[PDB]
Amino acid sequence: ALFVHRDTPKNNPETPFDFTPENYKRIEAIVKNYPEGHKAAAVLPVLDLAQRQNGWLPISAMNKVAEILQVPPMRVYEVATFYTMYNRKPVGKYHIQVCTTTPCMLRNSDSILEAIQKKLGIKVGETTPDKLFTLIEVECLGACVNAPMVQINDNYYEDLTPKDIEEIIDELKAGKIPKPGPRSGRFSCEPAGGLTSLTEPPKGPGFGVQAGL
Amino acid sequence: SNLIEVFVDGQSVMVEPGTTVLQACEKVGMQIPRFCYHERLSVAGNCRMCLVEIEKAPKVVAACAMPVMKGWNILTNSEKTKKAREGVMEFLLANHPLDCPICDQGGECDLQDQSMMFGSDRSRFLEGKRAVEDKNIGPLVKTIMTRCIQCTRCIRFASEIAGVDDLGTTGRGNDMQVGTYIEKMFMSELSGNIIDICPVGALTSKPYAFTARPWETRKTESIDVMDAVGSNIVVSTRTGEVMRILPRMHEDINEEWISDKTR
Amino acid sequence: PFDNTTYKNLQHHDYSTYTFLDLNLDLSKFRMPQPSSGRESPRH
Amino acid sequence: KTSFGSLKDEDRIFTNLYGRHDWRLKGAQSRGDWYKTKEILLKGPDWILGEVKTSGLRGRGGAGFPTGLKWSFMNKPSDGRPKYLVVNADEGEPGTCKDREIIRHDPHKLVEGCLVGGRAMGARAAYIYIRGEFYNEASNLQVAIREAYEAGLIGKNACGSGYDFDVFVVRGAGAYICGEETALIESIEGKQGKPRLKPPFPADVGVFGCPTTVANVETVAVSPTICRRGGAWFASFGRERNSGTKLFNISGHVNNPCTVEEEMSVPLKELIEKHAGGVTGGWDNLLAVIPGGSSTPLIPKSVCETVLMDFDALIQAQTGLGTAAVIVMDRSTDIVKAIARLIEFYKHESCGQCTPCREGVDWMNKVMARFVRGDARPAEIDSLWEISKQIEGHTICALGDGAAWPVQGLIRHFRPELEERMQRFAQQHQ
Ligand SMILES: Cc1cc2nc3c(=O)[nH]c(=O)nc-3n(C[C@H](O)[C@H](O)[C@H](O)COP(=O)(O)O)c2cc1C
Ligand code: SF4
Ligand code: SF4
Ligand code: SF4
Ligand code: FES
Ligand code: FES
Ligand SMILES: [K+]
Numbered sequence: 005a006l007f008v009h010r011d012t013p014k015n016n017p018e019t020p021f022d023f024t025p026e027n028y029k030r031i032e033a034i035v036k037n038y039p040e041g042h043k044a045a046a047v048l049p050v051l052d053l054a055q056r057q058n059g060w061l062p063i064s065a066m067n068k069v070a071e072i073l074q075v076p077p078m079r080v081y082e083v084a085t086f087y088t089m090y091n092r093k094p095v096g097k098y099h100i101q102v103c104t105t106t107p108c109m110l111r112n113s114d115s116i117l118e119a120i121q122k123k124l125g126i127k128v129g130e131t132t133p134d135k136l137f138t139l140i141e142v143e144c145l146g147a148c149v150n151a152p153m154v155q156i157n158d159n160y161y162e163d164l165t166p167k168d169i170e171e172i173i174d175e176l177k178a179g180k181i182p183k184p185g186p187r188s189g190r191f192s193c194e195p196a197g198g199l200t201s202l203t204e205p206p207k208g209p210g211f212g213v214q215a216g217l
Numbered sequence: 218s219n220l221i222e223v224f225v226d227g228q229s230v231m232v233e234p235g236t237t238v239l240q241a242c243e244k245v246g247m248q249i250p251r252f253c254y255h256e257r258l259s260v261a262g263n264c265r266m267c268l269v270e271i272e273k274a275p276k277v278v279a280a281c282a283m284p285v286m287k288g289w290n291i292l293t294n295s296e297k298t299k300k301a302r303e304g305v306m307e308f309l310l311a312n313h314p315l316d317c318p319i320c321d322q323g324g325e326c327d328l329q330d331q332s333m334m335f336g337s338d339r340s341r342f343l344e345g346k347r348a349v350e351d352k353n354i355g356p357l358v359k360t361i362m363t364r365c366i367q368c369t370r371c372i373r374f375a376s377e378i379a380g381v382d383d384l385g386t387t388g389r390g391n392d393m394q395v396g397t398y399i400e401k402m403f404m405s406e407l408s409g410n411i412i413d414i415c416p417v418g419a420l421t422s423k424p425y426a427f428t429a430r431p432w433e434t435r436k437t438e439s440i441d442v443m444d445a446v447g448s449n450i451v452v453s454t455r456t457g458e459v460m461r462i463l464p465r466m467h468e469d470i471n472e473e474w475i476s477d478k479t480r
Numbered sequence: 481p482f483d484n485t486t487y488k489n490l491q492h493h494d495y496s497t498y499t500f501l502d503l504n505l506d507l508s509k510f511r512m513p514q515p516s517s518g519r520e521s522p523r524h
Numbered sequence: 525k526t527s528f529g530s531l532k533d534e535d536r537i538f539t540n541l542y543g544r545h546d547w548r549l550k551g552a553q554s555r556g557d558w559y560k561t562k563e564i565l566l567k568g569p570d571w572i573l574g575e576v577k578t579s580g581l582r583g584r585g586g587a588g589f590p591t592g593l594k595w596s597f598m599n600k601p602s603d604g605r606p607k608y609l610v611v612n613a614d615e616g617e618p619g620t621c622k623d624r625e626i627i628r629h630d631p632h633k634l635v636e637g638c639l640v641g642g643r644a645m646g647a648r649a650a651y652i653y654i655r656g657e658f659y660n661e662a663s664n665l666q667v668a669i670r671e672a673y674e675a676g677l678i679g680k681n682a683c684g685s686g687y688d689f690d691v692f693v694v695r696g697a698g699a700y701i702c703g704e705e706t707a708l709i710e711s712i713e714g715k716q717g718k719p720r721l722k723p724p725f726p727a728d729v730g731v732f733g734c735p736t737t738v739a740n741v742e743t744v745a746v747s748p749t750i751c752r753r754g755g756a757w758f759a760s761f762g763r764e765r766n767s768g769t770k771l772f773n774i775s776g777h778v779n780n781p782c783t784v785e786e787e788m789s790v791p792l793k794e795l796i797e798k799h800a801g802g803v804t805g806g807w808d809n810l811l812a813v814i815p816g817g818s819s820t821p822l823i824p825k826s827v828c829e830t831v832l833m834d835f836d837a838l839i840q841a842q843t844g845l846g847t848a849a850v851i852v853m854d855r856s857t858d859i860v861k862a863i864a865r866l867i868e869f870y871k872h873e874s875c876g877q878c879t880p881c882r883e884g885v886d887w888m889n890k891v892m893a894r895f896v897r898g899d900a901r902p903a904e905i906d907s908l909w910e911i912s913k914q915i916e917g918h919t920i921c922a923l924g925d926g927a928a929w930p931v932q933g934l935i936r937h938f939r940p941e942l943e944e945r946m947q948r949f950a951q952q953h954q
Contacts, residue, residue: 199542266879
C-alpha cells in the first residue's frame with residue numbers, strides 16, 4: 005500500500021531475478037513490436053512478463069527490465085507503481101479480485117465479498133496463511149452485465165452468487181481449475197430469458213453490398 | 218517577417234509563431250501566475266494555475282503550453298480567469314500543510330505570494346489533509362514532501378539539465394509522490410538548484426535550514442570564484458554574516474544555475 | 481446445420497499464462513520491419 | 525422516420541455478439557467479414573473517408589466526435605514519419621462491457637476495421653491497446669490476428685491490394701485513465717498513462733510523436749460494414765446527426781442485464797422493457813438511470829419516461845450519451861452511496877497529473893462520504909457544486925469532467941434526499 009521501497013531481506017536489489025531463455029525470446033518478440041529508437045515502449049509488456057514468470061515484482065525484476073531495455077530504473081519504478089496490476093508485494097497463488105463499483109454493487113457484490121471472507125478467514129487486502137489466496141477489492145473489471153463477478157489471476161467468474169463463488173474457492177483449494185464464465189444459466193452476455201435478438205440465421209457474404217464494389 | 222498579431226487585454230502585440238500565451242502576455246509585461254512552468258525546463262502543464270480566458274472561447278487554456286493563434290484576445294484579468302485561478306489555488310491549498318512558520322520558504326514562497334495575489338482569503342476545506350512520508354536524497358536538500366504540490370520541476374530539472382533521470386512520480390491520484398522510490402542519494406554537481414526551482418518548501422537547503430529568513434537579508438550581487446565559469450551569485454547577508462548564496466540570472470554564463478560547491 | 485444453443489468460444493478455457501506472449505512470438509515473423517528514428521534511444 | 529428502435533437481424537452489424545457462432549476466420553468469413561476487402565482498399569483513402577463522413581458515424585468512445593471528420597485529419601501527405609491507427613480497447617468505464625464482447629466474439633471484424641481505417645488514414649500499422657484484465661479476450665484477438673496474417677489478409681500485401689499493414693496488440697496494466705486517447709498513447713510509449721495537453725493533437729504528434737488517430741473498438745469495427753453496405757444504409761438509422769446502430773449495455777437493477785445492439789434513437793423505456801426484462805419490480809420501481817456509463821449525470825424516472833438514447837436528446841436532457849452503458853437503479857437503492865462509490869472509483873482511477881482532479885476528486889470523495897452518513901450541513905451541497913464546477917473545464921483531460929458530472933447530476937436531481945439525510949443525522953446524533 006506504500007509507494008516507497010525499503011530493502012527487506014526478501015526484497016532487495018540482490019534478490020535473485022533473471023528471465024528464462026524462452027522468456028528472453030519472448031522479450032525479443034515484444035521489443036520487435038515497437039519502432040527502432042523507441043525500445044522504452046516495451047516497459048509495460050516486459051514488466052508484465054516478469055510478473056508472470058515470478059508471480060510478483062521484486063526490485064530486481066524492475067532493475068532487470070531497466071537493464072535489458074536500456075532505460076533509467078526510475079522510469080521502470082514509475083510504471084511499476086502507477087499501474088495497479090504490478091504486484092510489488094508477494095501475492096498468493098490465486099489472486100481474487102472482487103469488483104465493487106456501482107454496476108456490481110447494485111447487484112450485491114458485498115455478499116460475495118463477505119462469502120469469500122468468511123470462507124477464507126481473511127479480509128480485503130490479506131493473504132491466507134498458506135499463501136494460496138490474496139483477496140483485494142478492485143474497481144470496474146469490464147464485465148458489468150455479468151455483475152456480480154470476480155477475477156482469479158486471468159479468469160472472469162461471472163453472474164456469481166455466494167454459493168457459486170464458494171464452489172469456486174472449494175475447487176481452487178482442491179487443486180483443480182474452474183471454468184471462467186457466468187455461473188448462471190446463460191453463456192456470455194445474452195438476456196437470461198432467452199435471446200431477445202440475433203435468433204435469425206446471419207446472412208453471410210454478399211448481403212446488402214452496394215454496387216460497384 | 219511572419220509575426221502574427223495577438224491581443225492581450227485588447228493591447229496589440231506582435232509575436233513569433235509558436236509563442237505561448239504566457240510569453241505573449243509577458244511581451245506586454247503581465248506575468249501570469251505559474252507553478253509548474255519554468256522557462257528553462259520543458260513544459261509540463263500540470264498545475265493549471267496559468268489558466269486564462271481567450272474571449273469567444275468557452276474554456277480557459279493553459280497559457281504555459283498553448284500556442285497563440287492569430288487575433289486571439291487574451292483576457293488576463295477577466296472574471297472566469299480569476300475564478301479559475303482561485304479554484305486552482307483552492308485545490309493547491311486543500312492538502313497543503315499548515316507549516317508556514319516552521320518552513321524555510323516562508324516569505325519567499327510562490328504559493329504564499331500568489332495565494333495572496335490570486336487566491337481566495339479563506340478555506341472551504343473541512344476534511345483531514347494528507348501527510349507524505351519524507352524522503353532522503355542527501356546531506357544538501359532537506360526533503361519535506363508533505364509540502365510538495367506536485368509540479369514536477371524536480372523531475373524535469375534532474376532529467377534535462379542535471380541529466381540524472383532519478384527523480385520521478387510514484388503512485389497515482391492524490392497519493393502521487395515525488396521521489397526516487399528507493400533510498401537513493403541524489404548527489405549531482407547541480408543538485409542544489411532543485412532548491413531554487415521548487416516553488417514551495419518541499420525541497421529546502423539543509424545547510425541553510427532554519428538559520429535565517431528572506432525579508433531580513435541583504436542582497437549583495439557578487440561573483441563565484443570556486444571555478445573559472447564566473448557564475449553571478451547573490452550573497453545574502455544578515456547582520457554582518459553570510460547566510461546563503463543564490464544565483465543571479467546571467468544568460469551568457471550560468472543561465473540561472475550554480476553548482477553545489479558554489480552554493 | 482444451423483446451431484444457436486451452444487457457446488462456440490470454448491478455447492479460452494485452455495489458455496495458460498504465456499498464451500498472449502507465445503502468440504506474439506509466433507507473429508514475430510509475419511510482420512514488416514519497424515521504422516527507425518535514426519538513433520538508438522532519445523538518450524543517445 | 526418518427527419512431528425508432530425495433531432493429532431487425534438483417535441490419536445488425538455485430539452478428540455473433542453473443543458467442544453463439546464461431547468467432548474464428550472460417551466463421552467470420554461465413555457471416556460477411558473479409559468480403560471484398562481488396563476492393564475497399566483499392567478505392568483510395570478519400571472514398572473510404574467519404575463513406576464514413578456520409579454515414580454520419582460519431583465516435584463510440586464517449587466523446588461523440590464525428591468520426592469521418594476526425595479521421596480526415598490524417599488525410600495529409602507524409603513528412604517522413606510513419607502514421608499509426610490506434611484502437612482504444614481499454615474499456616474501463618463502469619457499466620461498459622461492449623468492446624469486450626466485440627473483441628471476444630467478433631475479432632476479425634475488429635481486424636478488418638483496423639485494416640480499412642488504417643488505409644483510410646494512410647497508417648503504417650495498428651496498435652490495439654487492449655485492457656490488461658482482458659487476458660482471455662487478448663489471446664482470443666491474437667488467435668484471430670494470427671489467422672488474418674496466415675490468410676494474407678493483413679501484413680505484407682494486405683488482402684492483395686499492395687498495402688503493407690501490421691496489427692499489434694498492446695496489453696494495458698490496470699489504469700482507467702489509459703482509455704483517454706493521449707494517456708493511452710503515453711502508455712503505448714512505455715510510460716505512466718498520463719494525458720497530454722492539446723495542442724498538439726494526436727494527428728500531429730501522437731504515438732512515438734507520429735501522426736495518430738485513436739478510435740474506439742466499436743467505431744473501428746463498424747467501418748467495414750459502413751464501406752460494404754454503404755454510408756446511406758448506416759445513416760438511415762437514428763435521427764440526423766445521430767446516425768446508425770449502437771451497442772447498449774443495460775445493467776444494474778434490471779431483470780435480464782444484457783449487452784444488446786439496437787437502433788440509435790431508441791427510447792430508453794423501450795430499451796429497458798424490451799431487452800432487459802424491465803426494472804426489478806416494474807417500471808414504477810425506477811429511481812434513476814445513469815444513461816451512458818459513469819461519466820454521465822443520472823436522470824430520474826420522470827426524465828427516463830420519454831427520453832431517447834442518442835447524443836442530442838441526452839444533451840438536452842442535461843446529461844450525456846457516452847459509452848451508452850445503461851445503469852438502472854430501483855427505489856431500494858441508496859443513491860448517494862452509489863454516486864459516492866462512483867466518485868471513489870474516480871479518485872482511485874485518476875492519474876494525479878494536474879491539480880483540479882488530483883485534489884478535488886479526492887475532496888469530493890470525502891464530501892460524498894460525509895453525505896452518505898449525513899455528517900454535513902446543507903451549505904456543503906452548494907459548496908460541493910462549486911467544487912465540481914472548479915474541476916470541470918480546468919483539468920488536462922476529461923476525467924475531471926467525468927468525475928464532476930455525477931456529483932452535479934446527483935445534486936440537481938436529488939438535493940432533497942441529501943437534505944433529509946443530513947437533517948435526520950442531526951436529529952439522531954445530537
Ligand atoms: C477518463 C477517460 C476514459 C476513457 N476511456 C475510454 C475507453 O475506455 N474506451 C474508449 O473507446 N474511449 C475512452 N475515452 C474516450 C477517448 O478519449 C476517445 O474519445 C476515444 O477513445 C476515441 O475517440 P472515438 O470516440 O472517436 O473512438 C475515455 C476518455 C476519458 C477522458
Ligand atoms: S511551502 Fe509555502 S505555503 Fe507551504 S508551508 Fe512553506 S511557506 Fe507555507
Ligand atoms: S518537490 Fe517541489 S519542485 Fe518537486 S514536484 Fe514537488 S513542488 Fe514541484
Ligand atoms: S483530470 Fe485527473 S486523471 Fe486526467 S490528467 Fe488530470 S489528474 Fe490526471
Ligand atoms: S462494475 Fe464490476 S465489472 Fe464493471
Ligand atoms: S503553469 Fe501552466 S499549468 Fe502549471
Ligand atoms: K524551495
